[PDB]
Design a protein around this ligand. Sequence first.
Ligand SMILES: Nc1ncnc2c1ncn2[C@@H]1O[C@H](COP(=O)(O)OP(=O)(O)NP(=O)(O)O)[C@@H](O)[C@H]1O
Ligand SMILES: Nc1ncnc2c1ncn2[C@@H]1O[C@H](COP(=O)(O)OP(=O)(O)NP(=O)(O)O)[C@@H](O)[C@H]1O
Ligand SMILES: [Mn+2]
Ligand SMILES: [Mn+2]
Ligand SMILES: [Mn+2]
Ligand SMILES: [Zn+2]
Lengths: 1024, 173, 173
Amino acid sequence: EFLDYKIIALLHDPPNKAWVITGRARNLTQQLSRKHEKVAKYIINQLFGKNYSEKVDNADKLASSIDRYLGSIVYKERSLFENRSIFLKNILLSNIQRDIGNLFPKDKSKLDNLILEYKKLLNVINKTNLILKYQLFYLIYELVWIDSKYENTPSDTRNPTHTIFDHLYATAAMMNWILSLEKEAKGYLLGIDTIGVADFISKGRKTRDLWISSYLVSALLWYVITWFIEEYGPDVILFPSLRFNQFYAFYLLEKLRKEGVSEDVIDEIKELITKYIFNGDDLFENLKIPPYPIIPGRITLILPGLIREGEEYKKVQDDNCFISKVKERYNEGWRKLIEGLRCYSERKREDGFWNLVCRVLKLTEDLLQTTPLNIRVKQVSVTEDEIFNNNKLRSDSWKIYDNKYRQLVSEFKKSKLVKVTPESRLKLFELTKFDKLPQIGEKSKRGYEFCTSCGVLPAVVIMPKEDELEKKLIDLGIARDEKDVRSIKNMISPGERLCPWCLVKRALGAEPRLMRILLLGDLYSVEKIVNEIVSRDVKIEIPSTSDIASIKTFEEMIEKKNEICEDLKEEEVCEKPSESVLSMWQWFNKNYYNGINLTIDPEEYWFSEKRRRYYFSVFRRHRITFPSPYYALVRADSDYLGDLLEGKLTPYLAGIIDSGDYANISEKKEEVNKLLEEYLVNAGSGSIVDYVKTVLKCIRENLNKCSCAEKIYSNEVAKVMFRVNVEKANVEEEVKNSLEYFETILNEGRIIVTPAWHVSISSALNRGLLVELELVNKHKGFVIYAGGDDLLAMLPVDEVLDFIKESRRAFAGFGTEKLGNMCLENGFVRINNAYYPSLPIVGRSYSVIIAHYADPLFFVINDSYNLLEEGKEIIRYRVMYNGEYKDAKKDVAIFRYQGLTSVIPLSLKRPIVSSVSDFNEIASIIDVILELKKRIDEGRISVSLLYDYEKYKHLIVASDEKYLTEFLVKDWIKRNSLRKHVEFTIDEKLYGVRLTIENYPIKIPNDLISNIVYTLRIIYGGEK
Amino acid sequence: STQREYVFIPITNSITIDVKITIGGSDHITNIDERGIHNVLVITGYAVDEKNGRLVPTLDPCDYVKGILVAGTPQQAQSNDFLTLKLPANKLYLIRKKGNISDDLKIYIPYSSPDARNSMKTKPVSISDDTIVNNIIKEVFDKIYNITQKEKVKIEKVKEDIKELFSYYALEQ
Amino acid sequence: STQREYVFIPITNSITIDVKITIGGSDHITNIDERGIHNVLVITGYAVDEKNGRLVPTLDPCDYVKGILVAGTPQQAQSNDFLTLKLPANKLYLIRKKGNISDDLKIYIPYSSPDARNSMKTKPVSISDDTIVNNIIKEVFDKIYNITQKEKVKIEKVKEDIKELFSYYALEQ
Ligand SMILES: Nc1ncnc2c1ncn2[C@@H]1O[C@H](COP(=O)(O)OP(=O)(O)NP(=O)(O)O)[C@@H](O)[C@H]1O
Ligand SMILES: Nc1ncnc2c1ncn2[C@@H]1O[C@H](COP(=O)(O)OP(=O)(O)NP(=O)(O)O)[C@@H](O)[C@H]1O
Ligand SMILES: [Mn+2]
Ligand SMILES: [Mn+2]
Ligand SMILES: [Mn+2]
Ligand SMILES: [Zn+2]
């Protein structure tokens, strides 16, 4: 029968929840006449009536931690520990609050207005797709709340840690478990992590191969979870939270466009999507796909013990259902994609290139059966024996979701010890021995001619070398005339050998619209997607490394449009843009319709050999700086994000409680017991903070079980009797459970995780994603992939220090400008008065590679990934912890340039932020290096400054006097200045900073002040 | 090059006597594309004084006005009662966005004396009485946009959009 | 309709010669009432231009200012470059509503000129540099209320509230 009434699980407690409690004027409490959910009941008008006996006695106590922080008697009675004000504390930082103010539904009329806005978007849907209205509501319930200006509320002013939405979505996520146990029995946790993504992304000549590799990584997982989001609704994914998800919103309004919905209500929500889920650009309507791959190849799911095909939900039949299901769904996604590729190819047997796609797909189907990228799926289960006592929840029924989650991840660790590359699933013995290998091109005089993109698989298509290609492609199976060469040579550089998987990549990159095949997912038939793709022909141009090395030159040529193309207009440069092309590269769209043909190939014009005499002379006469061949590959990631999601303290002190300090926490007892109490006391202003710190004074110094609570029960029993409507007396035990929970935390050494924790984290993660997206585009970068914590973008070597500074400060949630509609503010993200938290306590590392535009992207990507993953865990710098110099691990910026390395710390305080004074210390050295870079450009300081510091370090390190080191650096700068009197004044907190290493081939100066000059040498080598 | 001005669309009259520049440069920010009036500005916390309608600064967080922006200068005799000011165009609160922005702009707006003497109370207003929308199309929407009624078949969509979205709060005294 | 004057607090030492008689009504909208400062006035769409520190009217909703609403007159010579308007006291957007309700209020916003030639790339800057806090409580938070530092010595309850509740926008241009 029909079940899964989580629509009220999303509404049981309204977003008007904190003002109706401790009201200022008390109007809605008298104009609606068991106290405050009256409002939500009134809000229940669009769908089924509210069930009150299924989501407050469970799945609300189990979703968030408030049930265990406050106590299950003060949690519900909601009146015995009060406060006037209304704050909101960052989940990771209970230190900084907010001033909520009052822009919320007060009148009995405006609430009707918001109901009407929900209705007009939810009244055009019928009831045959019962699940589709819940689907769209899951997304727009917050977008409408914040679109109309309304600041969002915490779960309770007694503990302002979770925003009202994360609590709601968390109750909904737990409802998957609670329905599945009020029914017969089950409860599930499904995790999926793609095997070796770093190796897969590092496989491609052109950037248009990295882009589609990452896009496939995101899209295959999107295809497998399409089944779940349509089956059990969207709120089945606990990572990544799809509340601010571009892929999800795209799929959602595309499915809404499907089946027929008036194209007048589709816009009312498309504007919501384009403004907030995106940042204010609807190019995904002009590209027909979400422009950025943003799905992390590692997802989680809360699965219920139910299944369909009884036309409704029946109990699952076995305990191997979802593993097999996701495996077959994944392989099915890949096979559907390649089938659509072959269909779209046959639809264009002309154009040469697609003809080759045809005549190689038909030859290698038996080799394309295996997906180029496999996954690794684990699951953990639970039964009502664990969260029930035949009448209610158990005590320790809260520590279940943790113990299961902590369970699941451990399994992954086990499977991780063995890595099996995808190329091993093939069967290449009879091919590579008995010459059965299909070979479009020259049969290699030496066996079988390995590929050039993946470099590991035998190549199928062997483009000849560039000696005389036109007479070399016709007499071979590649071409048929002189016309196809101008389109085959357009996407296969002469000389490239291509494997089946690498050629499939090249073909998908020829036009990135077949990806919809996977983005929609059993939604349209493959032929229906292809027939759209073959209907419109708009070109999607992905840059190259050369197009990004030549950014500043294109810029300088749009500021001299006519003058620099007077002598031109015979070279197809000032040629008028004749097509309707567009790119996911925002800087490209910003130009092109600025006078210069940005579709040219710098490899063909000035990065070429037969030419560039012409172009050098041109750039010379018109005061144009001839370009540099170097771009910069920036890669980022958060540190100890797994440890974070597991609730550890390592993200807080990254360098002290390292990873083996949880194999035995007793050796780090002092630091955990200081930090956890510092956080717990600091979360919840109210009237309970004193109560809580008295509970901790009890726990502190191992005061025995309730042999001490008599010190504290007073502080509750004196207060429980401030209210009379309290029905029964239950204060004899709740004060015991409270310190039992607090001792549980302080003795396990980590905050116990709950679904609220996870949604609150992995929503801020996508918000930071949306922020860094607009950050990269500001610095003329090109986002290959950027999902939450990670990032992989190609920028010019000129705006990489600026970008690192800005992106680091923004990841903490602290900036200066608005980034679209995400107006970030000192640890929060203000979307038009809605304060969502951020990740200020989390450390983020960076790995910049200044690479020649012609370096092989395979090795560049491998070295970037290796530098990050290795250096971030092997180098230690002097950090101050509670006024005491210790050693730290993470938050470094590792620059490399063909043999020059440098590391730049970004924390200098091991708890990176505990106040609001810290938000300027963030990456405060990168702006020092910036200041120094803007002195050498102005010619005030000489570049000898970088080749002179050594004869000053040998004296500056043996020194223990600050005011002497200051004179010494001033003299090192004085001796190398060119103008009257420069002023650099290094901040004197960098002196004595000691970087170290655990004996790796990375060479690094042991002082930050020398890493600064090495970073400058790297940057300037980038302009060579 | 880039110097425009923001005009609002109320229910009442007294609009077209504000500008003699009704083309300015080559285009206008607000772009009717035969599907809807997009990129309309929305001033927050401001409202109209009904008599000789001009935009007044107030402090209610809910007061707002939604008008369109054209390249012009008011009457070539104003800039004594109007508010000129510059923005990087990422501070402009538009609606129903269709694309990017020029990122550098020179704007004027109908500025009004607050006149403390008036006990400031407002009342919301809605555009209806289609004689109103017809006359506002025939008074500004042809002079700023000659394209409409020439090849525009979806003028009715323009009417529907001005009926559905354009709204504001007014002192109503 | 007792006349009050809105005063704010930027980092600058600029709020000194602004209100000669820091009073002029029979009460104060604001109140330090054992929990800190309460009933703070918030206005949306403005920003404090610290050089000659006064609010500036822009159109961006990202921009807001916060200051203590007190009683007094605007230097007995202003309303030339200052602001003079009235309010119904109901439309307001108050922080920590704990004080009285006037239901009709004429106030004076320290105000500046647009000077529409520089593009106002505005940044958010909350209070820092604790010394400025400690000589602000001396300069303003003692000349508005004699109860400060006479009845209560526990000045810490407004000290942290200065940094927590007073956040404005700095143009820095
Ligand atoms: N959509 C994506 N596009 C590109 N890279 C991604 C994407 N999602 C995740 N990654 C990266 O892939 C890696 C995933 O972590 P991890 O799983 O440890 O790496 P891996 O390369 O997948 N190897 P393995 O750990 O064995 O699965 C990280 O480097 C991520 O930043
Ligand atoms: N429990 C988790 N859930 C989801 N994603 C995770 C989890 N743990 C790690 N990841 C992500 O998986 C990829 C690789 O994780 P990884 O970086 O190896 O773990 P980590 O905890 O971040 N430690 P570190 O090496 O310092 O970064 C990145 O996308 C991580 O953010
Ligand atoms: Mn992986
Ligand atoms: Mn990481
Ligand atoms: Mn790792
Ligand atoms: Zn290959």
